[PDB]
Amino acid sequence: GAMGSMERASLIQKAKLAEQAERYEDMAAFMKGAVEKGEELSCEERNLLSVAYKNVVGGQRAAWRVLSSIEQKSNEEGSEEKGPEVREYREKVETELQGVCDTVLGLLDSHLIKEAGDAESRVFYLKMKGDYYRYLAEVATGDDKKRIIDSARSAYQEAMDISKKEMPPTNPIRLGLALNFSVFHYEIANSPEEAISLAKTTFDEAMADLHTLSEDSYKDSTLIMQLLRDNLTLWT
Amino acid sequence: GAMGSMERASLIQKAKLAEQAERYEDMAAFMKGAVEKGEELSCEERNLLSVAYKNVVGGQRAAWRVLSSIEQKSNEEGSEEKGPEVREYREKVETELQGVCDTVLGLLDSHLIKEAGDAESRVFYLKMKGDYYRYLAEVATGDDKKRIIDSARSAYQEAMDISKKEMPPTNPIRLGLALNFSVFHYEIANSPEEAISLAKTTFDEAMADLHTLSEDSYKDSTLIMQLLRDNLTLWT
Amino acid sequence: FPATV
Amino acid sequence: FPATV
Numbered sequence: 001g002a003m004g005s006m007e008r009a010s011l012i013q014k015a016k017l018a019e020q021a022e023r024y025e026d027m028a029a030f031m032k033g034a035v036e037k038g039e040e041l042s043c044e045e046r047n048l049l050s051v052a053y054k055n056v057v058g059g060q061r062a063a064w065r066v067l068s069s070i071e072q073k074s075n076e077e078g079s080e081e082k083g084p085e086v087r088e089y090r091e092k093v094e095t096e097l098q099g100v101c102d103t104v105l106g107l108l109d110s111h112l113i114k115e116a117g118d119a120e121s122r123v124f125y126l127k128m129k130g131d132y133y134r135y136l137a138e139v140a141t142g143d144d145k146k147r148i149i150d151s152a153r154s155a156y157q158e159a160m161d162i163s164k165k166e167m168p169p170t171n172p173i174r175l176g177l178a179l180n181f182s183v184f185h186y187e188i189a190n191s192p193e194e195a196i197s198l199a200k201t202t203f204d205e206a207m208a209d210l211h212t213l214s215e216d217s218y219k220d221s222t223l224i225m226q227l228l229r230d231n232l233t234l235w236t
Numbered sequence: 237g238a239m240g241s242m243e244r245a246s247l248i249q250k251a252k253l254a255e256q257a258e259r260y261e262d263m264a265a266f267m268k269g270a271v272e273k274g275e276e277l278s279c280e281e282r283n284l285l286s287v288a289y290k291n292v293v294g295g296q297r298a299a300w301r302v303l304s305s306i307e308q309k310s311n312e313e314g315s316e317e318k319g320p321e322v323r324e325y326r327e328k329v330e331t332e333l334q335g336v337c338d339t340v341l342g343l344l345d346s347h348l349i350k351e352a353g354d355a356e357s358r359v360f361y362l363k364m365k366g367d368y369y370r371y372l373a374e375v376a377t378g379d380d381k382k383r384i385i386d387s388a389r390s391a392y393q394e395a396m397d398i399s400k401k402e403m404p405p406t407n408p409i410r411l412g413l414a415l416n417f418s419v420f421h422y423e424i425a426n427s428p429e430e431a432i433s434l435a436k437t438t439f440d441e442a443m444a445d446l447h448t449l450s451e452d453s454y455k456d457s458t459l460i461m462q463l464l465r466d467n468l469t470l471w472t
Numbered sequence: 473f474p475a476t477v
Numbered sequence: 478f479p480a481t482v
């Protein structure tokens with residue numbers, strides 16, 4: 001890989017610079033280089049990795065949705081035929097998106113998850129595995145769509161099982177996992193009741209544990225609790 | 237080039253899709269493909285080309301400024317030595333920026349300018365030549381900095397000479413050229429008095445010609461006149 | 473779209 | 478920074 005000659009610490013330093021410059025493709029490439037050094041990642045490093053790819057794929061998903069909407073409009077009654085270009089360009093963006101998801105899933109499988117023994121690391125990586133399978137599911141229309149959905153579900157479920165056993169209900173990783181799994185249920189699995197139940201139970205169990213927290217932890221937890229409430233408001 | 241197999245009309249169609257998806261790197265690559273077909277560009281096509289590269293280089297300039305500021309801070313008294321990484325990454329972004337500018341200048345030289353005979357096309361391309369030399373000048377620190385500055389000046393001057401002879405004072409291309417040349421004077425040529433004189437004379441001559449315009453042309457002209465006023469307000 | 477982190 | 482188009 002192109003980052004093979006760069007020191008691990010230099011890659012991490014440059015990832016932080018790239019973040020400040022809002023250069024998320026660079027940030028992701030630096031973090032990929034850092035993962036490929038083969039050492040485990042610290043908490044801060046895990047977050048850099050996630051921030052970088054979340055931003056890259058987030059932009060691709062937004063572009064894909066714009067193009068998909070145009071494509072859907074082209075296939076309505078009365079719409080003038082404009083040739084293959086809309087499908088082609090949507091496919092181009094889709095393929096690039098799938099490539100990024102496959103890259104992230106590859107890092108997780110080789111070998112981040114298998115070396116992650118602490119709950120905070122293992123849950124975080126399994127949540128990411130769920131997330132990137134969910135992004136694949138968003139664009140899937142073929143033979144493998146059910147398997148892709150199941151891969152997302154399985155990863156999220158393993159993460160949920162560990163989080164419930166090993167983390168307090170206010171832990172931000174536990175909360176963010178539940179938030180995202182709830183969205184999986186609503187948007188991917190056609191399970192809005194499960195989505196709503198999960199978000200409500202997560203919120204309520206967190207509420208009950210806030211009393212144990214410092215001011216700074218309270219701020220962290222309540223921010224994600226508000227995201228749960230926002231989704232509940234959207235869905236009810 | 238990778239776009240050599242794609243129809244000109246398909247490239248233009250996809251550039252428009254890329255714009256809607258805020259995929260400006262793609263938009264630029266599509267427009268580069270379209271220019272390389274060798275036919276002259278319509279007004280709409282010239283604007284697509286300019287929009288695409290303006291957005292790509294604009295992002296690179298913003299990133300370069302973030303990194304340059306960090307680098308400058310690192311070279312102040314009391315700042316802890318952090319190694320070569322900040323310089324290296326600023327250099328990386330700088331090199332990519334210079335590459336994009338060289339690409340645009342290359343399109344203009346091979347062969348957009350030489351085939352542009354109408355004032356609207358020729359002025360527009362010469363303004364772009366000034367603009368991309370100005371972006372090169374922003375990052376230049378070596379033997380050639382004076383020549384780069386002069387290349388920008390020369391292009392802007394030729395564009396100004398044609399615009400004054402061939403276009404009304406409210407023409408948006410004439411106004412945008414004057415706006416940008418004024419900024420060249422202020423930011424690149426260390427000539428704030430010339431910048432202010434140009435912006436004021438341009439504004440005032442445009443004001444006097446508004447009476448000749450339709451409602452829609454008035455809206456177009458006055459928008460750019462407001463940019464001139466905004467700069468004047470900043471500078472006085 | 474709904475919130476995710 | 479100043480306005481350009």
Ligand SMILES: *CC(=O)N1CCC2(CC1)CN(C(=O)C1(Nc3ccc(Cl)cc3)CCOCC1)C2
Nearest residue numbers: 043044047120124127172173174176177220477
């Ligand atoms: C070291 C570690 O595990 N992390 C991930 C959690 C984090 C610190 C770094 C707290 N945090 C957040 O609260 C936000 N992002 C986020 C939360 C939860 C997960 Cl699972 C992933 C990301 C909350 C949303 O706004 C950004 C920070 C990052």
Ligand SMILES: *CC(=O)N1CCC2(CC1)CN(C(=O)C1(Nc3ccc(Cl)cc3)CCOCC1)C2
Nearest residue numbers: 279280283356360363408409410412413456482
């Ligand atoms: C066909 C043609 O020459 N053009 C360039 C001028 C334009 C229509 C397409 C009007 N216009 C603008 O008013 C804005 N951009 C712009 C103005 C002037 C120049 Cl020289 C370049 C660009 C004004 C700023 O906001 C975007 C439109 C594009």
Ligand SMILES: [Mg+2]
Nearest residue numbers: 006007008009
């Ligand atoms: Mg080493």
Ligand SMILES: [Mg+2]
Nearest residue numbers: 091094095139
């Ligand atoms: Mg496909």
Ligand SMILES: [Mg+2]
Nearest residue numbers: 160197198201
């Ligand atoms: Mg359950």
Ligand SMILES: [Mg+2]
Nearest residue numbers: 242243244245
């Ligand atoms: Mg042809």
Ligand SMILES: [Mg+2]
Nearest residue numbers: 327330331375
């Ligand atoms: Mg350099």
Ligand SMILES: [Mg+2]
Nearest residue numbers: 396433434437
């Ligand atoms: Mg003069």
